[PDB]
């Protein structure tokens, strides 16, 4: 039950993958609040390139909207809509 | 469609997720070689917990074997098996 080479290469080469991302990364302006959940799942470019002088970066972006709980200290728990950026295609470019 | 609260939460709570991991970071000792591909897909703990004093951590691990191409500078390209650690179960625990 060893994973064969071309399978390994194909599954690791630069493409959009489901990545759990802290909401504060996307909304650093709203650092005073607490969010539930604190992490959200987003298609983002990752994996490797043929060379260690190339980076995996996106070429087509898009937005998705999710319901997130937001708590301000000495204030209420609100559930509300927040928008996040997703990556649809990726390319290997020089670093 | 707007993703519903309960669905966001279920998808992002502490669990094993396919993750692209740099082979250098798993074997810093073998820093002399070049790897192709240079990262691999592994089941690892990710996601968030109900609280900000808990970490997502593994409770059950195992090994998977993959065919990797190992290149030494001024030497040949050899494809051989390497072993990596996977997480099978995850739980939220204190830090």
């Amino acid at each position: 039950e060893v994973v064969k080479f071309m399978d390994v290469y194909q599954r690791s080469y630069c493409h959009p993958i489901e990545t759990l991302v802290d909401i504060f990364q996307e909304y650093p302006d709203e650092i005073e609040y607490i969010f539930k959940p604190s992490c959200v799942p987003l298609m983002r470019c990752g994996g490797c390139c043929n060379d260690e002088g190339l980076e995996c970066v996106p070429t087509e972006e898009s937005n998705i909207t999710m319901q997130i709980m937001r708590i301000k200290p000495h204030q209420g728990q609100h559930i509300g809509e927040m928008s996040f950026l997703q990556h649809n295609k990726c390319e290997c470019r020089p670093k | 469609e707007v993703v519903k609260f309960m669905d966001v939460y279920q998808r992002s709570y502490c669990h094993p997720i396919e993750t692209l991991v740099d082979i250098f970071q798993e074997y810093p000792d073998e820093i002399e070689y070049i790897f192709k591909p240079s990262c691999v897909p592994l089941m690892r703990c990710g996601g968030c917990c109900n609280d900000e004093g808990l970490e997502c951590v593994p409770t059950e691990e195992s090994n998977i074997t993959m065919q990797i191409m190992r290149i030494k500078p001024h030497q040949g390209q050899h494809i051989g098996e390497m072993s990596f650690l996977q997480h099978n179960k995850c739980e939220c625990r204190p830090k």
Partner: peptide
């Protein structure tokens, strides 16, 4: 075998 794109077995000949 262009370094910027994905794959053919006969790229991996050359190694």
């Amino acid at each position: 075998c262009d370094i910027h794109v994905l794959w053919e077995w006969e790229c991996f000949x050359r190694x």
